[PDB]
Design a protein around this ligand. Structure first.
Ligand SMILES: NC(=[NH2+])c1ccc2nc(C(=O)c3nc4ccc(C(N)=[NH2+])cc4[nH]3)[nH]c2c1
Ligand SMILES: [Ca+2]
Ligand SMILES: [Mg+2]
Ligand SMILES: [Zn+2]
Length: 223
């Protein structure tokens, strides 16, 4: 997250860190047994870490649970990143408490202008590399699809939306991938891609979760 602030320990209780010997992507807990992340974060051998703040220090509120199954969207296209979403089932249900909680799926899509909260442990430098150990947060609004499409001609589909600032300075980045974009208490996006991080007229692009609620519900109830 570039140009953001330290969230505060466990102030984003649905944020998950996906680990394969190191943190490589974020995710969101949707219920005690399931996590939604991005399909471009797919890997075999994932351990989900809940209740994290510093990912290098066991501070006492963590739960490390291995994934039993991953399901990448049936129509995910790794070249265009269209339908960039994946579900991960936990081997054991997590214990929900103040520090570990799930986030609600949306009942409708959000409007351009809505302010959201994006979080993660990804890179914090636009022109450089600095990976933080504690969770960073960023408040950013959903942008109009026209400013999104003018920034990425022929690359945006109906399953994507842009959020951020066109002036640059604030954006999600590598390492934030798969993490949450929450607006009005609902998970509306998943960190997916962008051009570099925090560059002018290159906002971040997010998977439009309101388009996959039926697929999510149907898939977790049958697995
Ligand atoms: N398993 C891997 N090797 C891997 C995993 C995630 C990656 N992600 C990128 C990436 O290139 C990438 N992930 C991004 C997320 C947000 C933004 C943004 N500017 N908002 C830009 C991003 N670029 N390469 C990746 C490689
Ligand atoms: Ca920790
Ligand atoms: Mg994240
Ligand atoms: Zn990524």
């Amino acid at each position: 997250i570039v140009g953001g602030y330290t969230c505060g320990a466990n102030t984003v209780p649905y944020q998950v860190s996906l680990n394969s010997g190191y943190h490589f992507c974020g995710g969101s807990l949707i219920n005690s047994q399931w996590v939604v992340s991005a399909a471009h974060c797919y890997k075999s051998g994932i351990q989900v870490r809940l209740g994290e703040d510093n990912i290098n220090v066991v501070e006492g509120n963590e739960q490390f649970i291995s994934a039993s199954k991953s399901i990448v969207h049936p129509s995910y296209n790794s070249n265009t990143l269209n339908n960039d979403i994946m579900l991960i089932k936990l081997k054991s249900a997590a214990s929900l408490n103040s520090r570990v909680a799930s986030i609600s799926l949306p009942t409708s899509c959000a409007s351009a202008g809505t302010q959201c909260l994006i979080s993660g442990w990804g890179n914090t430098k636009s022109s450089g590399t600095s990976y933080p150990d504690v969770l960073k947060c960023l408040k950013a609004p959903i942008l109009s699809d026209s400013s999104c499409k003018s920034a990425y001609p022929g690359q945006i589909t109906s399953n994507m939306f842009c959020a951020g600032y066109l002036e640059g300075g604030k954006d999600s980045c590598q390492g934030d991938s798969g993490g949450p974009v929450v607006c009005s208490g609902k998970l509306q996006g998943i960190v997916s891609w962008g051009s570099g991080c925090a560059q002018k007229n290159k906002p971040g692009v997010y998977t439009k979760v309101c388009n996959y609620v039926s697929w999510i519900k149907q898939t977790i109830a049958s697995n």
